[PDB]
Amino acid sequence: EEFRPEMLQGKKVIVTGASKGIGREMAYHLAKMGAHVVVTARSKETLQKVVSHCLELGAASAHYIAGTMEDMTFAEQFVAQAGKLMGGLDMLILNHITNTSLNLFHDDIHHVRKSMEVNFLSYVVLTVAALPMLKQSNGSIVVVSSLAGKVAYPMVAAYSASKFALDGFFSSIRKEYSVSRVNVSITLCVLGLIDTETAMKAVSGIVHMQAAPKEECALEIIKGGALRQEEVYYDSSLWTTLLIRNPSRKILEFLYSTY
Amino acid sequence: FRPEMLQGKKVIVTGASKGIGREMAYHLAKMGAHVVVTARSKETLQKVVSHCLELGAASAHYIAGTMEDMTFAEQFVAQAGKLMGGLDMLILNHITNTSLNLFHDDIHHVRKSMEVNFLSYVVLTVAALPMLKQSNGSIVVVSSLAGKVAYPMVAAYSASKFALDGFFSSIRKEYSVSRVNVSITLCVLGLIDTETAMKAVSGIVHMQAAPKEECALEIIKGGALRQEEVYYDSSLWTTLLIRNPSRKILEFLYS
Ligand SMILES: CC(C)[C@H]1SC(Nc2ccccc2F)=NC1=O
Ligand SMILES: CC(C)[C@H]1SC(Nc2ccccc2F)=NC1=O
């Protein structure tokens, strides 16, 4: 299966956390591919700037809806409003995360709960709401995760917990859809440190390492969802990408596929 | 391992009105440890404490309540500490009731699983850390194969167990760097012979259930030895494949 830019054109896609960083870049890449896009985040203005830019890039359609993913009601309403704005949905890209900084964990349960709600729970709510439209178009769901969602890393405990949660939930669902013959693909993207403006401000001091370009990253995530791959791995270190996979788990799940 | 290690240690066991938690309480009792057990069933906790005294526990008390209530969770540990005069080991074992079903739209079960199976464990840990640091204690987190590998019919449950791994494994990293001498043991359990589990998987999961009595003992031992991870499954193949050598290498390299 070879990826082609043509694959995306009459495709209707949603991109959360697209006002900046990787989400923003994906919006542009999709626009350059001339697809319908509905970007969301909290900041209304910065979102207007990305939409206009998308149209200039050739976006077949570019809209936005501002709101906070801390409120599950907005999460639901968004998928509906975004759906009618483009008359369908063929790909759901969950990319948003709550503001996260690097710190030792002490007693901030508030941040832990907020992380689980925004980084994990809303992805589930968003999925439930978009599944129907996705089943209709045999869509695809792309869940943006991190290396800290596959391995343990100090200073990002709450963040790591939410990303690990995504793997457990969405990987389990993937198996359910397989037997329930549900034609919706789920792509888990495991990313390493990326040169995002937010990432840089929070990384200088703890995560001492090379940061991959956000533009390439955003494209790799998109191509993975298009090829309907179960997982995408993108990091600046080839030695990390070499050890990040876990064949034992794949084998064990095969041996278990024979409930 | 030496049973003398627990000879008179102060231990908290959650979800101990039945199943694995109950067996752990009894093992601790026969070892002469001080034990405080919790769950929602007052009537049942009364019975476990009674048996614990019978088995030879240095001391045994219970405090009933639901871990869906974070305030109760926080206050429970402080009162448990007052009951034994401190704390040496915190065993987080409880989980919200979970049956096997495909995931449709039961957002309630997903959130409740995250709240009870994961968030309450964090609240409990935050409240017990002061006392655990005083005695260079240990935290024992009970998980499952479904917390290391994906499995259908238990999406919400699996999500919460994976979360425990990410959170507690990250904290362990911080503690070694921060000089926090409190061990964290994650227990990866295969199917266990508990009453609720045996009835929940009836006619669905076809695997040999390991004995809860032996399971409870290994969790204790692993906690006493301050082992980062305990793997317990009746199958030799599952025990081997459940490990992640790539992750251990990658992490050692990072640290
Ligand atoms: C937390 C933030 C600075 C960045 S860094 C990240 N994930 C990540 C990647 C590499 C190493 C450790 C990590 F945790 N995800 C993010 O959003
Ligand atoms: C969910 C419940 C019936 C039991 S079963 C379990 N873990 C587990 C073990 C083996 C296979 C699938 C699983 F999910 N953990 C539990 O507490």
Sign of torsion over alpha carbons B13, B14, B17, B18: negative
Output the six-digit token pair for A93. Answer: 């890209």
Q: Where are the alpha helices (DSSP H) in chain B?
A: 19-30, 42-55, 70-84, 107-113, 120-134, 155-178, 195-200, 212-224, 236-241, 245-254
- Determine the residue of A159, A166, A196 to mutate for testing ligand 1's pocket, defined as the one with the most ligand atoms within 8 A of the Cβ atom: A159
Q: Which residue has the tokens 């700037």?
A: A49
Q: How many CA atoms lie within 13 A of A226 on its CB side?
A: 24
Q: Give the burial string for A209-243 (b: 16+ CB within 10 Å, else e).
A: eebbebbebbbbbbbbbbebbebbbbbbeeebeeb
Q: In one letter, which amino acid is A204?
A: S
Q: CA B252, CA B248: separation in Å to the nearest integer?
A: 6
For B35, how many CA atoms within 13 A lie in the half-sphere containing its CB? Answer: 37
| Identity of the amino acid at B179 | R
Minimal Cα distance from B176: which residue of A?
Answer: A154
Helix, strand, or coil here: A50? helix
Please list every residue in chain A followed by a chain break, i.e. its C lies more than 2.5 Å from the next written N: 258
User: Was B203 annotated as part of a binding site?
Assistant: no
Of B41, B40, B35, B29, the closest CA to residue B13 belongs to: B35
- Residue B121 is among the residues annotated as catalytic for this protein: no
The CA distance from B8 to B28, in Å, is 9
> Do residues B118 and B167 make contact, with C-beta atoms less than 8 angstroms apart?
yes
Which residues in chain B have Cβ-Cβ distances shorter than 8 Å to A171?
A: 150, 158
Under 8 Å CB-to-CB from B92, ≥6 apart: which residues? B14, B121, B124, B125, B139, B140, B141, B142
CA distance A2 to A156: 36
Do residue B152 and residue A179 have CB atoms under 8 angstroms apart?
yes
Å from A106 to nearest chain B CA? 7
The answer to whether the CB of A192 falls within 8 A of the CB of A88 is no
Tell me, in angstroms, the distance from the centre of ligand 2 to residue A86's CA.
41
Between the alpha carbon of residue B179 and those of residues A131, A152, B89, B121, B176, the distances in Å are: 47, 18, 18, 22, 5
Amino acid, single-letter form, for residue A12: K
Amino acid occupying residue A20: K
Tokens of B8: 């008179």
Task: Tell me how far apart the alpha carbons of residues A154 and A135 are, in angstroms, rounded to a whole number.
Answer: 39
Which residue of A103, A111, A182, A248 is the best one to mutate when testing the B interface, meaning the one whose CB has the most B CBs within 10 A?
A248
Match 């752990």 to its residue by tokens: B24
In chain B, the domains with their CATH numbers are 1-255 (3.40.50.720)
Total residue count of chain B as it appears in this document: 255
Structure tokens given for B240: 């081997």
Q: How far is CA A89 from the centre of its chain?
A: 16
User: Pairing between strand B89-92 and B10-13?
Assistant: parallel
Residue A251 neighbours by CB distance under 10 Å: 14
For residue A98, the number of C-alpha atoms closer than 13 Å in the C-beta half-sphere is: 24
Q: How many residues does chain A have?
A: 259
Q: Report how far residue B157's alpha carbon sits from residue B112's, in angstroms, rounded to the nearest whole number.
A: 10
Which of B148, B204, B241 lies nearest to residue A259, judging by beta carbons? Answer: B204
DSSP secondary structure of B33-67: -EEEEEES-HHHHHHHHHHHHHHT-SEEEEEE--T
- Pocket of ligand 1, beta carbon within 6 A: A 100, 146-148, 153, 156, 159, 192-193, 199, 202-203, 207
Residue B163's nearest CA partner among B186, B138, B132, B189 is B186
Cβ pair B117, B165 in contact under 8 A: no
**What's the Cα-to-Cα distance from A124 to each of A259, B103, B139, rounded to whole Å?**
24, 10, 30
What three-state secondary structure class fits A187? strand
The token pair that represents A212 in the structure block: 């991959």
- Nearest one of A258, A208, A210, A199 to A238, comparing CA atoms: A210
Whether A48 and A30 have beta carbons less than 8 Å apart is answered as no
Give the whole-angstrom CA distance, residue A38 versus residue A63. 5
CB-CB contact of A95 with A166 (8 Å): no
Backbone angles phi, psi at A82, to 5 degrees: -70, -35
Measure B127 CA to ligand 1 centroid, in angstroms. 28
d(CA A88, CA A139): 10
Experimental method: X-ray
Tell me the two tokens of residue B151: 């499995």
| DSSP three-state, residue A188 | strand
In the chain, the amino acid numbered B10 is: K
Cα separation of B166 and A160, whole Å? 5
The answer to whether B163 and A162 are in contact (CB under 8 A) is yes
Cβ atoms of residues B39 and B17 within 8 Å: yes
How many other CB atoms sit within 10 Å of the CB of residue B134? 13
Q: How far apart are CA A77 and CA A85, in angstroms?
A: 12
Q: What is the DSSP letter of B192?
A: B
| DSSP assignment letter at B5 | G
Resolution of the coordinates in A? 1.9
Cα atoms found within 13 Å of the Cα of residue B171, Cβ hemisphere only: 28
Which one, of B171, B77, B87, lies nearest residue B133 by Cα?
B87
Q: Which atom of ligand 1 is nearest to the CA of A160?
A: 14
Find the discontinuities in chain B where C to next N exceeds 2.5 angstroms and give the residue preceding each.
none
Alpha-carbon distance of A213 to A58, in angstroms, equals 23
Among A9, A7, A25, smallest CA distance to A60 is for A9
Best mutation site among B109, B154, B195 for ligand 2 pocket (most ligand atoms within 8 Å of CB): B154
Work out the angle between the directed axes of helices A214-226 and A21-32 (0-180°, nearest 10).
60
- Backbone φ and ψ for B237, nearest 5 degrees, come out as -70, -40
Instruction: Evaluate whether B176 touches B228 at the Cβ level (below 8 Å).
Output: no
The values of phi and psi at residue A55, to 5°, are -60, -45
User: With contact defined as beta carbons under 8 Å apart, do B232 and B243 qualify?
Assistant: no
